[PDB]
């Protein structure tokens with residue numbers, strides 16, 4: 001893959017690919033991602049950090065916004081607590097091999113000019129649109145709060161995009177990103193990552209929902225987690241184990257199997273893995289065993305580096 005294709009790889013969308021190519025032509029390029037700090041850093045975060053590392057390899061300076069105040073607004077707790085979690089998060093991303101600069105939302109998001117821009121952009125953003133943009137982001141709430149519609153206008157604040165060529169996030173961010181693209185002086189390139197399915201398989205992988213593999217989980221816990229994971233034969237859609245195989249595993253992948261169930265297998269691409277599986281020629285147990293073991297290896301230097 002040339003640089004663009006390495007960046008494109010495993011992304012759900014790039015807005016736009018022709019803005020991206022324009023950016024690649026510059027020397028100094030910078031890419032931002034923001035995270036509500038999470039108590040556990042899981043494969044969902046790792047997917048995104050891997051993409052930040054792609055960009056880093058392509059010569060981008062990486063900025064990570066530790067979005068404590070957004071996390072406050074999105075009901076994840078008190079600010080001082082969210083900040084400590086953010087410092088943990090920082091440690092985990094650095095363990096992953098990302099070389100980035102880290103900015104804490106609270107350090108600038110209470111400045112008068114920032115706030116004035118929250119208010120300015122609240123006048124330009126409808127309630128309907130704001131609520132729409134948060135459908136995939138908002139904390140579950142029977143009685144949705146005003147905080148919910150403040151969150152996306154804050155996320156579109158020009159201070160976040162000053163000097164940044166590209167913003168990265170999951171597909172759940174896309175409506176907020178489209179709003180920024182409409183409201184800011186400068187259109188920033190959006191690169192969107194896919195959103196991982198939970199181990200249990202209903203919704204998406206989340207720290208607050210107990211359906212995650214944390215990058216620091218021990219080998220034992222990773223096995224037990226992937227043991228109980230949802231993963232039907234021939235069913236590639238919403239299968240977290242196949243997602244793990246697609247997004248984390250290096251190919252060719254040598255799957256282990258007893259001789260009495262076809263013997264050890266080699267798949268030279270995720271494409272090959274997918275057909276073998278969708279043809280009901282690779283059973284869940286065998287895929288599960290192979291994903292658990294390759295994951296442990298993948299994660300080992302991160303978990304050990306975290307000690």
Ligand SMILES: N[C@@H](Cc1ccc2ccccc2c1)C(=O)O
Nearest residue numbers: 033034035036067070155160167
């Ligand atoms: N909304 C994100 C956090 C988040 C908050 C503010 C941002 C500002 C600019 C670019 C990305 C940003 C991501 C989350 O769901 O974790």
